Design a binder for this molecule. Sequence first.
Ligand SMILES: Nc1ccn([C@H]2CC[C@@H](COP(=O)(O)OP(=O)(O)OP(=O)(O)O)O2)c(=O)n1
Ligand SMILES: [Ca+2]
Ligand SMILES: [Ca+2]
Length: 343
Amino acid sequence: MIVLFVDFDYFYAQVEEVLNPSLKGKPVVVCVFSGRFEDSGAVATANYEARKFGVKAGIPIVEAKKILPNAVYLPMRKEVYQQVSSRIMNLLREYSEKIEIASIDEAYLDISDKVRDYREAYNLGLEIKNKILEKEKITVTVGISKNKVFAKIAADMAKPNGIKVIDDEEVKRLIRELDIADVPGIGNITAEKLKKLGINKLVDTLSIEFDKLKGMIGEAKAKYLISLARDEYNEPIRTRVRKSIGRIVTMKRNSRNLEEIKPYLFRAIEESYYKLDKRIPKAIHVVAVTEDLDIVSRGRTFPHGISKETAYSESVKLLQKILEEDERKIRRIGVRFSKFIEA
DNA sequence: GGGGGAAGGACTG
DNA sequence: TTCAGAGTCCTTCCCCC
Ligand SMILES: Nc1ccn([C@H]2CC[C@@H](COP(=O)(O)OP(=O)(O)OP(=O)(O)O)O2)c(=O)n1
Ligand SMILES: [Ca+2]
Ligand SMILES: [Ca+2]
């Protein structure tokens, strides 16, 4: 069983350059604006030409312009990218029936019984990595191994515009050299904890006791990690499925007064139902972002589907349920639906 | 007595 | 006065056929 991981080199900012040729040869920064502060918002992405100086996705636009002020800041357009991605996913779909799309710029391929060895697999990464670069003019990084996790790591190492292959003899090697947070699934927090205790490489975990690991990161986190070092990871490539389609916005405000939030919720509660397709959610939650970070949420599950209007109503009771439980103003407010109806 | 629901946190990425 | 913008899965926890 050998996997083929695909990762769009560096998506957004890249597509933005593909459409506007007068961009390349410059540090581009695709980000999200809110309409406030003046330059309020965060960074969604940036080309490698812009990363060099630190402008990494997720930071305040005000900071970005603190390091790379001359760079090229372009507004985010999830609509434009969505379509591109939607196209690339379809190609890969012809190379292997068993496909699994993770995010908007990722996809796992299973070639187990359509490839003889890592030799003709690396040749396939190319045959693919190319059909892509010129049919959509998008560069991508490919990863290959015996499973999804290692396949995804080989792609991390080889980026950008590359491809790598983590063979078995190499795997055992990585399980020793591969370290800290460079592990898919383990976030900064879990890392700033493990490190403090000496655990650096994915192996250091084996010199512990499953329980002493659980008491600090969790049974899932641990079991997962120990499943890697032990080298017995399973997880197959199955078709993905939308579980929770939601939408959130941002108030130029920072309010607490219902009619100073109702229009907002209503707004989001509109866009979400457009993505719901022909789905019927039995569950709905109102996510609310405050000011001093920390998000708050209140939701409810129904024994039947939901109609837009049905949503509007509960939205309020769920919002009041929030306010009366916190003494801080709100900045962004949103809603998320789930538990769609089966077959 | 494993599961459904609700609020929180983290990693997505 | 007024910072940093979609979806999944793990968890602490209370509760019931
Ligand atoms: N805080 C973040 C981080 C990433 N993304 C977006 C960036 C596009 C998509 C995938 O991100 P990555 O793959 O991590 O980066 P990339 O630039 O898309 O590509 P690469 O992984 O090769 O750097 O998710 C985002 O919306 N918010
Ligand atoms: Ca990518
Ligand atoms: Ca990615």
